[PDB]
Amino acid sequence: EKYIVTWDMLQIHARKLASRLMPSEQWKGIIAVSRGGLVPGALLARELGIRHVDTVAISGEGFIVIDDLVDTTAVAIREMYPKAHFVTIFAKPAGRPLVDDYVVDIPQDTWIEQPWDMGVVFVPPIS
Amino acid sequence: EKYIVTWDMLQIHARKLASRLMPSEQWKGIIAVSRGGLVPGALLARELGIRHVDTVAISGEGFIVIDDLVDTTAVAIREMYPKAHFVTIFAKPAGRPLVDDYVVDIPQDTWIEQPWDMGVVFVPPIS
Amino acid sequence: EKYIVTWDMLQIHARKLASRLMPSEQWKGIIAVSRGGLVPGALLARELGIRHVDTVAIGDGEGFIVIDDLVDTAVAIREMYPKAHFVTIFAKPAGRPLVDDYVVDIPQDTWIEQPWDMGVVFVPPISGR
Amino acid sequence: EKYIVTWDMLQIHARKLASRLMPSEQWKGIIAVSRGGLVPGALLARELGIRHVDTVAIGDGEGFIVIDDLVDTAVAIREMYPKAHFVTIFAKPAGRPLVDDYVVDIPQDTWIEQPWDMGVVFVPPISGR
Numbered sequence: 001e002k003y004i005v006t007w008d009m010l011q012i013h014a015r016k017l018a019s020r021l022m023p024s025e026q027w028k029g030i031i032a033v034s035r036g037g038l039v040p041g042a043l044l045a046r047e048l049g050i051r052h053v054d055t056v057a058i059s060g061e062g063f064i065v066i067d068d069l070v071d072t073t074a075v076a077i078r079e080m081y082p083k084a085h086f087v088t089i090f091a092k093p094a095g096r097p098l099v100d101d102y103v104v105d106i107p108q109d110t111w112i113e114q115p116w117d118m119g120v121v122f123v124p125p126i127s
Numbered sequence: 128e129k130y131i132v133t134w135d136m137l138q139i140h141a142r143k144l145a146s147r148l149m150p151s152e153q154w155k156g157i158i159a160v161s162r163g164g165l166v167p168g169a170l171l172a173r174e175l176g177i178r179h180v181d182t183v184a185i186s187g188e189g190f191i192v193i194d195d196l197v198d199t200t201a202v203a204i205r206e207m208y209p210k211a212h213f214v215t216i217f218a219k220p221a222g223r224p225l226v227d228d229y230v231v232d233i234p235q236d237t238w239i240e241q242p243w244d245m246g247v248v249f250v251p252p253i254s
Numbered sequence: 255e256k257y258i259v260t261w262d263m264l265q266i267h268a269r270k271l272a273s274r275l276m277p278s279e280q281w282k283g284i285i286a287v288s289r290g291g292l293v294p295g296a297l298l299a300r301e302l303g304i305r306h307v308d309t310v311a312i313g314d315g316e317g318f319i320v321i322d323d324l325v326d327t328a329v330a331i332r333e334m335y336p337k338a339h340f341v342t343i344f345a346k347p348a349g350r351p352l353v354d355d356y357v358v359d360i361p362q363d364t365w366i367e368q369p370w371d372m373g374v375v376f377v378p379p380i381s382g383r
Numbered sequence: 384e385k386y387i388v389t390w391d392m393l394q395i396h397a398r399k400l401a402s403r404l405m406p407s408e409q410w411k412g413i414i415a416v417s418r419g420g421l422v423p424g425a426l427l428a429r430e431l432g433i434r435h436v437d438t439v440a441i442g443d444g445e446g447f448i449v450i451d452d453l454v455d456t457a458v459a460i461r462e463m464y465p466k467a468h469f470v471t472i473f474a475k476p477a478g479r480p481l482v483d484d485y486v487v488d489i490p491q492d493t494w495i496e497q498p499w500d501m502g503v504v505f506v507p508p509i510s511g512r
Contacts, residue, residue: 001270006247006262007390008503015380015502024381034435038415038425045418046499049381052417057435113249116429119398120133120391123246126269127278127303128399133391134261135374142373142509151510161306165286165296172289173370176510179288184306243300246269247262253398254407254432260503367505374389377502 003112005090010115013089013103014040018047020101021064021087028062029054031084033077036068039116040089060084068114070095070102130239132217137242140216140230141167145174147228148191148214155189156181158211160204163195166243167216187211195241197222197229256365259344264369267343267357268294272301274355275319275341282317285310285338287331290323290368294343310334324366325349325356385494388473393498396472396486397423401430403484404448404470411446414439414467416460419452419497423472439463453495454478454485 021027021044030050032041034057041053044066056065058073060081067073069090077086078098088095090112091102106112148154148171157177159168161184168180171193183192185200187208194200196217204213205225215222217239218229233239275281275298284307286295295307298321312330315338320331326346344366345356360366404410404427413436415424424436427450441459444467449460455475473495474485489495 004247004262004266006260007394007498008260008262011390011499011502012258015377019380022380024383035425035428038428038436039422042418042421042425043499047380049379049383052440053421053438055436055438115247115390116394116426117249118247119250119394120131120242120245120247121250122240122244123248123269125303126272126276126301131391131395133389134265134369135389135391138261138370138373139387142506146509149509151512162296162299165299165307166293169289169292169296170370174509176508176512179311180292180309182307182309242261243265243297246265250398252432253401253405253430258503371505372503373506374387374501374503375506376496376500377504 003106003110004118005112005114007115010040010089011043014043015047017087017089017101017103018044021048021085024048024050026062027064027085029064031056031060031063031065031081033058033065033067033073035116036114037066040068041066056080069106069112070099074098130233130237131245132239132241134242137167137216138170141170142174144214144216144228144230145171148175148212151175151177153189154191154212156191158183158187158190158192158208160185160192160194160200162243163241164193167195168193183207196233196239197226201225256367257344257360258367258372259369260372261369264294264343265297268297269301271341271343271355271357272298275302275339278302278304280317281319281339283308284319284321285335287312287320287322290370291321291342293370294323295319295321323368324360325353326362328352385496386473386489387496387501388498389501390498393423393472394426397426398430400470400472400484400486401427404431404468407431407433409446410448410468412437413448413450414464416441416449416451419499420450420471422499423452424448424450452497453489454482455491457481 031054058076061083063084065084065086070088087101158181185203188210190211192211192213197215214228286292299307315335318338320338320340324344325342326349341355415421428436444464447467449467449469453473454471455478470484
């Protein structure tokens with residue numbers, strides 16, 4: 001098949017990650033990596049109570065740097081923010097040792113499709 | 128555009144209809160008209176506490192007959208079940224006087240797409 | 255942890271099951287077991303082109319698809335319809351061997367939360383603020 | 384009654400707005416106003432092909448898209464970015480005249496429930512049984 005990620009599921013995953021980052025008072029802010037980190041970043045911010053989310057784009061103590069998935073950009077993040085808490089929603093075998101924390105494990109060979117790249121449209125019957 | 132109906136929204140509509148049919152003890156059962164009435168029927172049954180949903184297919188006192196939308200089949204239902212409480216989730220101007228109750232009003236010219244006929248798939252960017 | 259099942263995901267499972275039930279030309283009808291099997295039965299009917307779904311509260315069975323949401327007794331269903339193709343969406347271990355086909359394997363101790371018993375509502379922030 | 388907004392519907396609105404913002408070749412970037420505007424900004428960036436979304440907690444503006452979720456003060460945004468194209472998803476009456484473009488009209492007294500503040504959870508049957 002194909003690893004489909006719906007909004008509801010992404011939200012559930014993000015909420016689990018949020019609870020794992022408590023207490024919220026220990027964080028100064030959240031840095032989301034465009035574009036995949038934007039939505040998960042906004043969710044964490046809403047769950048933790050952080051009013052503002054900063055954004056970056058690749059080619060910091062107390063800050064959380066978030067990205068949707070880590071397959072291989074992790075390096076650039078580590079160089080720019082050495083003291084940041086790098087977290088991701090999904091993680092493959094290769095990138096697993098790069099993030100400080102993640103939520104769901106997906107096989108290296110899985111084609112994962114994110115909710116922002118999909119939509120609800122008419123799907124013809126199989127018959 | 129096109130009138131898109133998602134699962135969550137259909138469920139909300141059904142729940143509103145369910146609350147309008149209280150008390151639940153006054154109903155003997157629920158008759159769903161295949162196929163559009165199946166899902167809404169199962170939802171009502173779950174909300175009212177009716178363990179079994181009967182099904183019919185067109186070419187009853189205490190029973191609720193449900194269909195997804197009434198555009199023009201309403202007649203056949205009235206003949207087969209003269210004492211049934213005919214209800215629908217959606218209703219257009221033409222069929223509005225035929226049902227005993229409904230939830231949402233949609234223009235006669237609106238192309239309504241139901242959740243069971245759709246799905247979450249990849250949608251190319253507009254750019 | 256409970257196995258949350260959203261409408262979208264259930265539909266994916268149902269469609270996948272429909273694919274296995276092809277071609278549709280062989281099936282004479284669908285018998286959805288109330289009350290959970292009704293929704294997946296409706297989805298199957300749609301995907302297979304079957305215009306009518308019959309329901310039973312519990313005709314030899316040949317050509318009919320008997321569907322229920324989960325399995326873990328099916329013995330009664332098999333007794334009522336011996337020659338029917340009994341299928342389900344989810345299935346636990348002990349119940350796995352009794353169905354003709356299913357889609358997702360669920361651990362015996364896992365509590366499945368079906369879409370129809372849930373709803374989209376306000377959820378307070380974990381931090382309370 | 385509150386205006387419930389689900390992820391699916393929000394996305395539909397966002398895409399519709401994106402269509403009006405075409406072609407994309409004219410925009411130099413997107414400035415999402417925290418914290419609600421960030422999600423729609425991400426969707427716009429995706430639809431328009433804009434690789435980076437900037438955020439502001441509140442460069443003349445020419446070529447940039449300043450987006451927020453709802454409007455009903457925008458006066459500060461207009462002051463910070465005079466030559467920017469201020470857009471939103473929803474908009475109330477009093478706030479309608481201040482935005483350059485929006486998608487859905489919301490009555491002034493309507494309480495909008497955004498997707499990010501909601502979640503899919505168990506909902507007890509109305510009949511209690």
